[PDB]
Amino acid sequence: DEWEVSREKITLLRELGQGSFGMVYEGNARDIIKGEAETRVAVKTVNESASLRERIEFLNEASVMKGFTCHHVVRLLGVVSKGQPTLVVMELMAHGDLKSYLRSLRPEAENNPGRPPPTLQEMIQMAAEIADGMAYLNAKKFVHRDLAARNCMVAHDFTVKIGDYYRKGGKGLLPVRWMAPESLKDGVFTTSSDMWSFGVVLWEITSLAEQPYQGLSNEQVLKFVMDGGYLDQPDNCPERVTDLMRMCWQFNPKMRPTFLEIVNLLKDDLHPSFPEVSFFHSEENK
């Protein structure tokens, strides 16, 4: 409602890549945040191949995001809903998705930015931020359903946030290699099966985003995990992250931690700013 922004305040710089509804652009937004003359933004658009239904759904999803104020979830900044084209204006995440970011710190990487792979301190900070954002989503009664490094984003200051590979199935496409065994079985998704996928994200973080279950076909992964298999620990993985993975990969979903529980385990070794920005420490959790 008060989220409307004049189309004329958005300038578009360059393509960021295809999103679910259309091309996402990097841009600038004039006078969109009090105290900032100009804000780097991501700008979501919808293909002209969209049905009227998809255009209406594109805007309805932005409406849902108006209810979200969490430092560790990529936030909506504004909507262009009057006239066409329509634009959903998001916080810019200048280091892109977490999978591409991880692969770029591999020693072999052509786009290596000349810094070493993540430290233990950096990996625990990442884990806490992702879990804090997921805890927020869960309090808002949303099951993510698709947690994976590809759907986590990295900010200019390297904060990780929840953003917004697949086999066909009876209810839609399934991210088989990130799915809990009970989801492979009946196709139900819960915060507990989200906690499974969180463990896979920690595995991607500690493997610099190798492909989970490489060398296994989608059909074999589905049987391996349903039987009780799980990923092997990457070489020289810190014990502390290995212990998180083991919690996440309990076969019984009832024995997995909650996202608030993850942040509690990690809270004492975080950047000093974390209690200032986290959902965990906020009065919305107290």
Coordinates of C-alpha atoms in Angstrom, one line a residue:
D1 CA 0.0 0.0 0.0
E2 CA 2.6 2.5 1.2
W3 CA 5.1 0.2 -0.7
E4 CA 4.3 1.8 -4.0
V5 CA 7.2 3.5 -5.7
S6 CA 7.2 5.6 -8.8
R7 CA 8.5 3.8 -11.8
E8 CA 10.6 6.9 -12.6
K9 CA 12.7 6.4 -9.5
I10 CA 14.0 3.0 -10.7
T11 CA 17.0 2.9 -13.0
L12 CA 18.2 -0.4 -14.4
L13 CA 21.9 -1.1 -14.8
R14 CA 22.3 -4.7 -16.0
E15 CA 20.9 -8.3 -16.0
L16 CA 21.3 -10.3 -12.9
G17 CA 19.6 -13.5 -14.2
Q18 CA 16.4 -15.4 -14.7
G19 CA 14.0 -15.5 -11.8
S20 CA 10.8 -17.6 -11.4
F21 CA 8.7 -14.9 -13.2
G22 CA 11.1 -13.1 -15.4
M23 CA 14.5 -11.4 -15.7
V24 CA 16.0 -9.9 -12.6
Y25 CA 18.0 -6.7 -13.0
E26 CA 20.5 -4.9 -10.9
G27 CA 19.5 -1.2 -10.6
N28 CA 19.4 1.9 -8.5
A29 CA 16.4 3.4 -6.7
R30 CA 16.1 7.1 -6.0
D31 CA 14.8 8.1 -2.5
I32 CA 13.4 4.8 -1.5
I33 CA 15.0 4.5 2.0
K34 CA 14.8 7.6 4.3
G35 CA 18.3 9.0 4.7
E36 CA 19.6 7.4 1.4
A37 CA 19.6 9.4 -1.7
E38 CA 20.0 6.2 -3.8
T39 CA 19.9 2.5 -3.0
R40 CA 21.4 -0.4 -4.8
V41 CA 18.4 -2.7 -5.6
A42 CA 17.5 -5.9 -7.3
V43 CA 14.5 -5.4 -9.6
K44 CA 12.3 -8.4 -10.4
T45 CA 10.2 -8.4 -13.6
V46 CA 7.8 -10.9 -15.3
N47 CA 8.2 -12.2 -18.8
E48 CA 5.8 -10.9 -21.5
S49 CA 5.1 -14.6 -22.0
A50 CA 3.2 -14.5 -18.7
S51 CA -0.5 -15.2 -18.5
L52 CA -2.6 -12.7 -16.6
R53 CA -2.7 -15.2 -13.8
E54 CA 1.1 -15.2 -13.4
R55 CA 1.2 -11.4 -13.4
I56 CA -1.3 -11.3 -10.7
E57 CA 0.6 -14.0 -8.8
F58 CA 3.9 -12.2 -9.2
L59 CA 2.4 -9.2 -7.4
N60 CA 0.7 -11.3 -4.8
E61 CA 4.0 -12.8 -3.8
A62 CA 5.4 -9.3 -3.2
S63 CA 2.4 -8.6 -1.0
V64 CA 3.3 -11.6 1.2
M65 CA 6.9 -10.2 1.5
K66 CA 5.5 -6.9 2.9
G67 CA 5.0 -8.9 6.1
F68 CA 8.7 -9.8 6.5
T69 CA 11.2 -7.7 8.4
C70 CA 14.2 -9.9 9.1
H71 CA 17.8 -9.0 8.7
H72 CA 18.6 -12.6 7.5
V73 CA 15.8 -12.7 4.9
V74 CA 16.2 -10.7 1.6
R75 CA 13.7 -8.0 2.1
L76 CA 11.2 -6.2 -0.2
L77 CA 11.8 -2.5 -0.6
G78 CA 9.0 -1.5 -2.9
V79 CA 6.6 -2.4 -5.7
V80 CA 5.7 -0.9 -9.1
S81 CA 2.1 -2.2 -9.6
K82 CA 0.6 0.7 -11.6
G83 CA 0.8 0.3 -15.3
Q84 CA 3.1 -2.1 -17.1
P85 CA 5.7 -3.4 -16.7
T86 CA 5.4 -4.2 -13.0
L87 CA 8.5 -4.3 -10.9
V88 CA 9.3 -5.9 -7.5
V89 CA 12.2 -4.0 -5.9
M90 CA 14.3 -6.1 -3.5
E91 CA 17.4 -5.5 -1.4
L92 CA 20.5 -6.0 -3.6
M93 CA 22.6 -9.0 -2.6
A94 CA 25.9 -8.0 -4.3
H95 CA 27.7 -11.3 -4.0
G96 CA 24.9 -13.3 -5.5
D97 CA 23.7 -16.8 -4.5
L98 CA 25.6 -18.8 -2.0
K99 CA 26.4 -21.7 -4.3
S100 CA 28.2 -19.5 -6.9
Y101 CA 29.9 -17.6 -4.1
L102 CA 31.3 -20.8 -2.5
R103 CA 32.5 -22.2 -5.8
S104 CA 34.4 -19.0 -6.4
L105 CA 36.6 -19.6 -3.3
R106 CA 37.8 -23.0 -4.6
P107 CA 41.5 -22.9 -5.2
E108 CA 41.1 -23.8 -8.9
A109 CA 38.4 -21.2 -9.5
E110 CA 38.8 -18.9 -12.5
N111 CA 36.8 -16.1 -10.7
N112 CA 38.7 -16.6 -7.3
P113 CA 38.7 -13.2 -5.6
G114 CA 42.1 -13.8 -4.0
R115 CA 41.0 -14.6 -0.4
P116 CA 41.1 -18.0 1.2
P117 CA 38.1 -20.3 1.6
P118 CA 35.7 -19.6 4.5
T119 CA 37.2 -19.9 8.0
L120 CA 35.5 -21.8 10.8
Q121 CA 34.4 -18.5 12.2
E122 CA 32.9 -17.5 8.9
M123 CA 31.1 -20.8 8.4
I124 CA 29.6 -20.6 11.9
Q125 CA 28.4 -17.1 11.2
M126 CA 26.9 -18.3 7.9
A127 CA 25.1 -21.2 9.6
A128 CA 23.7 -18.8 12.3
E129 CA 22.4 -16.3 9.8
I130 CA 20.8 -18.9 7.6
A131 CA 19.2 -20.6 10.7
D132 CA 18.1 -17.2 12.1
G133 CA 16.3 -16.4 8.8
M134 CA 14.8 -19.9 8.7
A135 CA 13.6 -19.5 12.3
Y136 CA 11.9 -16.2 11.2
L137 CA 10.2 -17.9 8.3
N138 CA 9.0 -20.7 10.6
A139 CA 7.6 -18.2 13.1
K140 CA 5.7 -16.7 10.2
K141 CA 4.4 -20.2 9.5
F142 CA 6.2 -20.7 6.2
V143 CA 7.9 -24.0 5.3
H144 CA 10.7 -23.0 2.9
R145 CA 10.5 -26.3 0.9
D146 CA 13.6 -25.5 -1.2
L147 CA 16.5 -24.6 1.1
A148 CA 19.8 -25.1 -0.7
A149 CA 22.9 -22.9 -1.2
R150 CA 21.5 -21.8 -4.6
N151 CA 18.6 -20.1 -2.7
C152 CA 20.8 -18.4 -0.1
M153 CA 22.2 -14.9 -1.0
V154 CA 25.4 -13.1 0.1
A155 CA 25.4 -9.4 0.8
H156 CA 28.0 -6.7 0.2
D157 CA 29.3 -7.3 3.7
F158 CA 29.0 -11.1 3.3
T159 CA 25.9 -11.5 5.4
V160 CA 24.0 -14.6 4.3
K161 CA 20.2 -14.3 3.9
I162 CA 17.3 -16.5 2.8
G163 CA 16.4 -15.4 -0.8
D164 CA 13.4 -16.1 -3.0
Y165 CA 18.5 -30.4 -9.4
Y166 CA 14.7 -31.1 -9.7
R167 CA 12.7 -34.2 -10.7
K168 CA 9.1 -34.3 -11.8
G169 CA 6.7 -35.7 -9.2
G170 CA 3.0 -36.1 -8.3
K171 CA 2.8 -32.6 -6.7
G172 CA 5.4 -30.7 -8.7
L173 CA 9.1 -30.6 -9.1
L174 CA 11.2 -32.0 -6.3
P175 CA 14.8 -30.9 -5.1
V176 CA 15.7 -34.6 -4.5
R177 CA 19.2 -34.1 -3.3
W178 CA 18.2 -31.6 -0.6
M179 CA 15.1 -33.5 0.6
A180 CA 14.6 -35.4 3.8
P181 CA 13.8 -39.1 3.6
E182 CA 10.1 -38.7 4.8
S183 CA 9.6 -36.2 2.1
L184 CA 10.9 -38.6 -0.6
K185 CA 8.3 -41.0 0.7
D186 CA 5.0 -39.1 0.9
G187 CA 5.9 -35.7 -0.3
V188 CA 5.1 -33.8 2.9
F189 CA 7.3 -30.8 3.7
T190 CA 7.8 -29.4 7.2
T191 CA 10.1 -27.2 9.1
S192 CA 11.8 -30.5 10.1
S193 CA 12.5 -31.4 6.5
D194 CA 13.7 -27.9 6.1
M195 CA 16.2 -28.7 8.9
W196 CA 17.4 -31.7 6.7
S197 CA 18.1 -29.3 3.8
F198 CA 19.9 -27.0 6.2
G199 CA 22.3 -29.8 6.9
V200 CA 22.9 -30.2 3.2
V201 CA 23.6 -26.5 3.0
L202 CA 26.3 -26.9 5.7
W203 CA 27.6 -29.7 3.6
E204 CA 27.7 -27.4 0.5
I205 CA 29.5 -24.8 2.7
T206 CA 32.1 -27.3 3.9
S207 CA 32.6 -28.8 0.4
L208 CA 32.6 -25.4 -1.4
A209 CA 29.3 -26.5 -3.1
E210 CA 30.1 -29.8 -4.6
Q211 CA 27.1 -31.6 -6.0
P212 CA 25.4 -33.6 -3.2
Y213 CA 25.6 -37.4 -4.0
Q214 CA 27.7 -36.9 -7.1
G215 CA 27.8 -40.0 -9.2
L216 CA 24.4 -41.2 -7.9
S217 CA 21.5 -40.7 -10.2
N218 CA 18.3 -39.0 -8.9
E219 CA 16.7 -42.4 -8.7
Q220 CA 19.6 -43.8 -6.6
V221 CA 19.6 -40.8 -4.3
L222 CA 15.9 -41.3 -3.7
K223 CA 16.6 -44.9 -2.6
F224 CA 19.9 -44.2 -0.8
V225 CA 18.4 -41.5 1.4
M226 CA 15.0 -43.3 2.0
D227 CA 17.0 -46.4 3.2
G228 CA 18.8 -44.1 5.8
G229 CA 21.8 -43.0 3.8
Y230 CA 23.3 -39.5 4.1
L231 CA 26.2 -37.6 2.7
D232 CA 29.8 -38.3 3.8
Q233 CA 31.7 -35.6 5.6
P234 CA 33.8 -33.5 3.3
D235 CA 37.6 -33.7 3.7
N236 CA 38.9 -31.9 6.8
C237 CA 35.4 -30.6 7.7
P238 CA 35.4 -28.9 11.1
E239 CA 34.1 -31.2 13.8
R240 CA 31.7 -28.4 14.9
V241 CA 30.0 -28.3 11.6
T242 CA 30.0 -32.1 11.3
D243 CA 28.1 -32.2 14.6
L244 CA 25.4 -29.9 13.2
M245 CA 25.0 -32.1 10.1
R246 CA 24.5 -35.2 12.3
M247 CA 21.7 -33.4 14.2
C248 CA 20.1 -32.3 10.9
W249 CA 20.3 -35.8 9.3
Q250 CA 18.5 -37.8 12.0
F251 CA 16.2 -40.2 10.2
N252 CA 13.3 -39.5 12.5
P253 CA 12.2 -35.8 11.8
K254 CA 11.2 -35.5 15.5
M255 CA 14.8 -35.9 16.6
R256 CA 16.1 -33.0 14.4
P257 CA 16.8 -29.6 16.0
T258 CA 14.7 -26.5 15.4
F259 CA 16.2 -23.5 13.7
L260 CA 15.9 -21.5 17.0
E261 CA 17.9 -24.4 18.6
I262 CA 20.6 -24.0 16.0
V263 CA 21.1 -20.3 16.7
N264 CA 21.1 -21.1 20.4
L265 CA 24.0 -23.5 19.9
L266 CA 26.0 -21.0 17.9
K267 CA 25.1 -17.7 19.6
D268 CA 28.2 -17.4 21.8
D269 CA 30.6 -17.3 18.9
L270 CA 29.1 -14.7 16.5
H271 CA 29.9 -11.2 15.3
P272 CA 29.1 -8.6 18.0
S273 CA 26.4 -7.2 15.7
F274 CA 24.4 -10.4 15.6
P275 CA 22.2 -9.7 18.7
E276 CA 21.5 -6.2 17.3
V277 CA 20.0 -7.6 14.0
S278 CA 18.9 -11.2 14.7
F279 CA 15.3 -12.5 14.9
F280 CA 16.6 -14.8 17.6
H281 CA 17.5 -11.9 20.0
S282 CA 14.6 -9.7 18.9
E283 CA 11.5 -8.9 21.0
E284 CA 9.5 -10.8 18.3
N285 CA 11.2 -14.0 19.8
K286 CA 11.0 -12.9 23.5

